[PDB]
Amino acid sequence: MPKKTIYFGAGWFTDRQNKAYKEAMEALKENPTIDLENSYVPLDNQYKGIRVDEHPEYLHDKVWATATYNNDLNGIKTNDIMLGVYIPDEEDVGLGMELGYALSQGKYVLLVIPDEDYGKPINLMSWGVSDNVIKMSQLKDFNFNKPRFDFYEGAVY
Amino acid sequence: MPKKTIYFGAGWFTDRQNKAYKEAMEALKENPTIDLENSYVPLDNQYKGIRVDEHPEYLHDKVWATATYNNDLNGIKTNDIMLGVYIPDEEDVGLGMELGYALSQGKYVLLVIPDEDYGKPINLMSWGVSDNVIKMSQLKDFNFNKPRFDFYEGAVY
Amino acid sequence: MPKKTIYFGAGWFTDRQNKAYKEAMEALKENPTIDLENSYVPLDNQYKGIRVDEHPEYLHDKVWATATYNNDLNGIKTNDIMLGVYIPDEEDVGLGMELGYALSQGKYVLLVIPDEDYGKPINLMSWGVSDNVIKMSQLKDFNFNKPRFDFYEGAVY
Amino acid sequence: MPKKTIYFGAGWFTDRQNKAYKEAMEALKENPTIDLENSYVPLDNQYKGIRVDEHPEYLHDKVWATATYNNDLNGIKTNDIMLGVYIPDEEDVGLGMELGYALSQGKYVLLVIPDEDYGKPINLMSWGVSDNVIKMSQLKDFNFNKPRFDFYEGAVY
Amino acid sequence: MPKKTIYFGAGWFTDRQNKAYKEAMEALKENPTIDLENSYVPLDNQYKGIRVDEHPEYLHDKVWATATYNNDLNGIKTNDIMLGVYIPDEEDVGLGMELGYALSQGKYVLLVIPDEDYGKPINLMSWGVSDNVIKMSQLKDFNFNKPRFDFYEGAVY
Amino acid sequence: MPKKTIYFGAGWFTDRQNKAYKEAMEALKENPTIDLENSYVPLDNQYKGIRVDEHPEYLHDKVWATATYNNDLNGIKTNDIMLGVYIPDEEDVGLGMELGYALSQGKYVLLVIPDEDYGKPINLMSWGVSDNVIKMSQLKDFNFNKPRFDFYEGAVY
Ligand SMILES: Nc1ccn([C@H]2C[C@H](O)[C@@H](CO)O2)c(=O)n1
Ligand SMILES: Nc1ccn([C@H]2C[C@H](O)[C@@H](CO)O2)c(=O)n1
Ligand SMILES: Nc1ccn([C@H]2C[C@H](O)[C@@H](CO)O2)c(=O)n1
Ligand SMILES: Brc1ccnc2[nH]cnc12
Ligand SMILES: Brc1ccnc2[nH]cnc12
Ligand SMILES: Brc1ccnc2[nH]cnc12
Ligand SMILES: *[C@@H]1C[C@H](O)[C@@H](CO)O1
Ligand SMILES: *[C@@H]1C[C@H](O)[C@@H](CO)O1
Ligand SMILES: *[C@@H]1C[C@H](O)[C@@H](CO)O1
């Protein structure tokens, strides 16, 4: 098969986020239309190897912030597809921004929602930016060579 | 004497959001470089007048959603400036998306934060999309004819 | 009192096209939110004054074509609003292209259809690019300072 | 060889359209730089499997129209190359729009004209959006890995 | 009576550059379609007032560079028109970049060349990005409300 | 490995330019993440085979200039990556423009500087457009499948 690369848009700040993250990453490893090795994973592309957790003084460093912001934008713009791991109860402003950038860069925008949450209401603008929204259990078999437009089968506020 | 129009980006989903919203609107009324009458306020431009809070039957109507999403994008693209009323503790995914769209449409992107919150950490991607970020009490006097790039005097996460 | 400029998108290749053209121009003269004098009219901006109808020697001149094409794109990109005078039975490929360019340049895209034709089916892609579609008799009073998204009250094919 | 995907921009509303469609599709099947399987063919991507011919009531459904319009845009934006099967005597507004969108998305824009019609006049804006225009008989051997800019060897009005 | 704002694109690194700069600024002061007061002049918008010529300690500060680069992009994107003061014998890479950004932001791109140099060859890519190119002595009277595409009356290389 | 294509942005007007050109081309031949055959090399894509050196009358031909400019833009837009061979002492306005276009087209923008010059000051706008800047000796081993954002380790004016 041909393979496409993605940007792994996913929060890592809550238990539900980290669960969905692990699940989505596992689904991508099993999906044969995805080149995960050459995809952009934010958490493995930390500027200069420095760990924002082990040294939180870097959250006042404007150079760190500039480089990290730009790395993410670059990760979106140089890969085929924008993936948003999306928790309806824990909606993320950063992801929202990235979705808007992905749209502007002409990328397919795919949201993935945990099966337990699929159907719960999501922000209108999330509903609208997305080209499609699927459940976590569909991610391993999603054909990224033939991405199509569809509507969320769920609520929007 | 020259005046600019804005898109009023703001959540309306919490008490702090609604407080900041009311404050920002009052600041705009007093700002002599702003034409507020010809500006786009999402809450007054929802398809058919309906708000999914006041009429929850439209929470699954895809026509309402399509038209409302598109009207907001149109409100961003046809106005001079993008405004984001921004609560650091209650960040909004919808606004995040709109910030990214505004960037893509070449708009000055100004965040306004309540004075009581100015300085609190904001999402890196919000920090990065923004051209500038000011406090609520600066909004009435901000010169929208000479908008400049500046860094938030505050943290990111 | 604020005024917007437009690009006058319209075919001039049939009797119905020319009729609608004349009507739309008269409506614009009477509309107080339009600065028609500073607007771009393709037919008056062809390279060197020449019209391939009035001087068919320029039908193979690539310089004339380059300059005229570029001037039209420039006329779209430097004006506030994109207008498409639109005959459902005599749709125009050139205008279609210009609608797509206008979309890409972040312009409000307004179709105007002769009252006698308003409601007739229009191409899906015209329906979709457009932000709104109105009847000729609405054009003189349309408020270009507060342009909104609306759906055609009519069919597509 | 490396292979590129396309969007199959072609009308299906006249005898000449359907002839050129069949020919262009055959040429693509034989072209070794094209991955036709993973290309976007509108007519095989009808929303929800519903047949606009067998159920023409869906031409008043705004959801059907929204999804179909968006699928086409998505088909253009997620594929490498924009292909416009172009009949000079039957110029298509929908294709025109799609050409403008393709330009905006940074795609190579290739028009293909039946050999019997190559040379006949085409709209200036079609001439201008295109990066190249070739005859149907050149399509099977076109090297899509090395697409180049050239001018139509033909008239433009 | 309507006025446009500009971005003052110009090198300041040679005697001819500085001469042309002074001349162009004087022309703009006298041009009644230009609002010079609300226009963006890079040299007066450098981060913190500092010029790497007057304070060379900032020649390795990445914060100064980030903010100054971003302010210039912002100055281009929030003003109506892109101006390039252009010396054919002393072409400037920085201005070149800014011309390309201006193009991407849908701005009219006007080059102005000292009368003594008008006609000398200019880089092809400068020739191509530009919408028009005029002589210094035309700048005071140029009608920025009706900007049109025209070709340089001069050579390229 | 997956391979990416590039646009070979490099002047050919000085001894230092031609040296860096030869070196960069050699590095690309040895880099296994690059498909050089299907990359766009300006100097081998001269319009219609005509040699601007052997026939310098074509530098007044507007058709030659139109086609050549458009070929370059096309070469940037249809390839994966923008490469700028960059001489700090011989900065090129044409390259600058192309860098701005590449940014606008969503491309990774890589500057390459001869090792003997790496560290010398470069224009701010060059520093800013670039996603990364490396030395000639790093080009053969650069992983174009995982391009990342970084800052020039050098001066900027
Ligand atoms: N029902 C909704 C939800 C969101 N928004 C837009 C406007 C606000 O700025 C932001 C709120 O999340 O997104 C909207 O217009 N209507
Ligand atoms: N000779 C031509 C052909 C087309 N057009 C542009 C302007 C019209 O809106 C549309 C007409 O097809 O395209 C033009 O300016 N000149
Ligand atoms: N230190 C610098 C270098 C360049 N520029 C911008 C503004 C000029 O138009 C162009 C000069 O090279 O680029 C700038 O603002 N500051
Ligand atoms: Br830390 C960090 C790294 C990358 N993206 C982010 N978005 C918000 N915080 C972020
Ligand atoms: Br039905 C239909 C489907 C897809 N594209 C179209 N353009 C005009 N009608 C269309
Ligand atoms: Br000749 C020539 C060919 C291609 N690009 C160029 N840029 C400046 N001169 C050029
Ligand atoms: C960008 C990376 C991640 O997807 C989000 C977190 O807020 O921002
Ligand atoms: C988009 C699909 C097809 O190419 C045209 C028909 O008008 O619109
Ligand atoms: C575009 C091709 C080359 O890279 C430069 C020369 O000025 O312009």
PDB file of C-alpha atoms in Angstrom, chain A residues 35 37-41 45 47 63 66-67 70-71 74 77-79 105 107, chain F residues 2 4 103-109 129 131 143 145-151:
ATOM      1  CA  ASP A  35       4.010   5.700   8.067  1.00  0.00           C
ATOM      2  CA  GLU A  37       8.067   6.378  11.848  1.00  0.00           C
ATOM      3  CA  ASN A  38       8.181   9.492   9.635  1.00  0.00           C
ATOM      4  CA  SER A  39       5.137  11.113  11.296  1.00  0.00           C
ATOM      5  CA  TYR A  40       5.511  14.012  13.726  1.00  0.00           C
ATOM      6  CA  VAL A  41       4.907  13.200  17.373  1.00  0.00           C
ATOM      7  CA  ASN A  45      10.246  16.372  19.314  1.00  0.00           C
ATOM      8  CA  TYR A  47      13.240  21.370  21.569  1.00  0.00           C
ATOM      9  CA  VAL A  63      13.215  31.077  22.546  1.00  0.00           C
ATOM     10  CA  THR A  66       9.270  30.074  19.694  1.00  0.00           C
ATOM     11  CA  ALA A  67      11.130  26.901  18.666  1.00  0.00           C
ATOM     12  CA  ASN A  70       7.380  26.478  15.208  1.00  0.00           C
ATOM     13  CA  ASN A  71       8.298  22.776  15.416  1.00  0.00           C
ATOM     14  CA  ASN A  74       6.325  22.554  10.897  1.00  0.00           C
ATOM     15  CA  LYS A  77       2.757  21.506   7.451  1.00  0.00           C
ATOM     16  CA  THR A  78       5.326  18.874   6.352  1.00  0.00           C
ATOM     17  CA  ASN A  79       3.057  15.809   6.931  1.00  0.00           C
ATOM     18  CA  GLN A 105      -2.356  24.183   5.060  1.00  0.00           C
ATOM     19  CA  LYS A 107      -4.543  18.935   5.139  1.00  0.00           C
TER      20      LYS A 107
ATOM     21  CA  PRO F   2      10.779   7.230   1.436  1.00  0.00           C
ATOM     22  CA  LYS F   4      11.185  13.683  -1.147  1.00  0.00           C
ATOM     23  CA  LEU F 103       6.516  29.568   2.832  1.00  0.00           C
ATOM     24  CA  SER F 104       3.182  30.515   1.320  1.00  0.00           C
ATOM     25  CA  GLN F 105       2.919  27.082  -0.304  1.00  0.00           C
ATOM     26  CA  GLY F 106       3.444  25.256   3.001  1.00  0.00           C
ATOM     27  CA  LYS F 107       6.912  23.858   2.143  1.00  0.00           C
ATOM     28  CA  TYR F 108       9.773  23.071   4.488  1.00  0.00           C
ATOM     29  CA  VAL F 109      12.315  25.803   3.813  1.00  0.00           C
ATOM     30  CA  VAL F 129      11.489  32.529   6.460  1.00  0.00           C
ATOM     31  CA  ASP F 131      12.612  26.561   8.909  1.00  0.00           C
ATOM     32  CA  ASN F 143      16.916  13.412   6.844  1.00  0.00           C
ATOM     33  CA  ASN F 145      11.627  12.600   5.944  1.00  0.00           C
ATOM     34  CA  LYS F 146      11.928  14.207   9.410  1.00  0.00           C
ATOM     35  CA  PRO F 147      12.638  17.914   8.716  1.00  0.00           C
ATOM     36  CA  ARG F 148      12.638  19.959  11.939  1.00  0.00           C
ATOM     37  CA  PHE F 149      12.621  23.630  12.929  1.00  0.00           C
ATOM     38  CA  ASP F 150      15.905  25.076  14.194  1.00  0.00           C
ATOM     39  CA  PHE F 151      17.704  28.433  14.398  1.00  0.00           C
TER      40      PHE F 151
END
